[PDB]
Ligand binder design. Structure first.
Ligand code: ANP
Ligand code: MN
Ligand code: MN
Lengths: 318, 10
């Protein structure tokens, strides 16, 4: 059994509108992890129990080099905890905000690893729904680690659909902004938005007001820098097609359409999943407590059976 | 630019 007192709480890594992520050290092993702490009272009040159970189930049942692995999943009288592997390299958002834009080869490396992770998720009948730079992390070696499985949906095979209006505003697919249901192709639109941000240095559509932003996603056409390579323009135009049926990856073969696109011609997909490719950036962390790749807004902050959640209480064998 | 973006669920 795993308890709250088995860990040392060092510093805050990130904070959401629902929960917080703290860098912890396991007392018995000396190993460092990232603990996502969620408050039970907030989750029950917002009727978000199903999504939280799914987040646990996806973290427990997935095994891929580009997905954050779960060590422990436990609960107390008022809190829900996820002890995940710590991504020392920070968010892709931190790096992109600093560097303004990435080269096409650097974007290709990250994009290839995200595609590999999304292929795996879709093959396990899981749709991610929240692809964004804040959810795409880098480990100590510089490889992608997708975190935050909070909006995942299980049991979505082939052309199966979802009905929940969810995601992140700036990353929402046009079909999600329409009534009724949507398919797995929403993840390819999300991939398109992050690839656009990485290669063009800005979001494809932006406005501070959500109502105006939604109009842009549904109605405005994408623009590309004149100097962007034709293969990159084609990848982005394909991933950012408004109709999911016309979108790259929106067909019956799903990930295969994205994998076989000319932008990824130089990529060996088996070399990607086996981590044989050299990272274009290696995090320069000196210790396991070095949080230089996390925002100061978070790290400088000081940290201080009827309610039983099902399908929790996990411990990893590997 | 672009500020931090958070998720939602209806
Ligand atoms: N495994 C991890 N290692 C290091 N940092 C992490 C890890 N998981 C999450 N974080 C950081 O904590 C932040 C928030 O965690 P996240 O799981 O995205 O919370 P959330 O409330 O679901 N956010 P959102 O739904 O996107 O508004 C992330 O954006 C990361 O910066
Ligand atoms: Mn997140
Ligand atoms: Mn989330």
């Amino acid at each position: 059994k795993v308890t709250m007192n088995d860990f040392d709480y060092l510093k805050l890594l990130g904070k959401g509108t629902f929960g917080k992520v703290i860098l912890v050290r396991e007392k018995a092993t000396g190993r460092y992890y990232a603990m996502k702490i969620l408050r039970k009272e907030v989750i029950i009040a917002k009727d978000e129990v199903a999504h939280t159970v799914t987040e646990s189930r996806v973290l427990q049942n997935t095994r891929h080099p580009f997905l954050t692995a779960l060590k422990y999943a436990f609960q107390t009288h008022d809190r829900l905890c996820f002890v995940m592997e710590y991504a020392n390299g920070g968010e892709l958002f931190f790096h992109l905000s600093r560097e303004r834009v990435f080269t096409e080869e650097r974007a290709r490396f990250y994009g290839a690893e995200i595609v590999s992770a999304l292929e795996y998720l879709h093959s396990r009948d899981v749709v991610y729904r929240d692809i964004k730079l804040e959810n795409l992390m880098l480990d100590k070696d510089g490889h992608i680690k997708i975190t935050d499985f909070g909006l995942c949906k299980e049991g979505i095979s082939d052309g199966a659909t979802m009905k929940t209006f969810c995601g992140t505003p700036e990353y929402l697919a046009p079909e999600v902004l329409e009534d009724n249901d949507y398919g797995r192709a929403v993840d390819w639109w999300g991939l398109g938005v992050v690839m656009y941000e990485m290669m063009c240095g800005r979001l494809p559509f932006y406005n501070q007001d959500h109502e105006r932003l939604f109009e842009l996603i549904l109605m405005e056409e994408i623009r590309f820098p004149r100097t962007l390579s034709p293969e990159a323009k084609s990848l982005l135009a394909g991933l950012l097609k408004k109709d999911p049926k016309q979108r790259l990856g929106g067909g019956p073969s799903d990930a295969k359409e994205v994998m076989e696109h000319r932008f990824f011609l130089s990529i060996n997909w088996q070399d990607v999943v086996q981590k044989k490719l050299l990272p274009p950036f290696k995090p320069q962390v000196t210790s396991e407590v070095d949080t230089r790749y996390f925002d100061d807004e978070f790290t400088a902050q000081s940290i201080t059976q009827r309610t039983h959640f099902p399908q929790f209480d996990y411990s990893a064998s590997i | 630019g672009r500020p931090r973006t958070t998720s939602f669920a209806e």
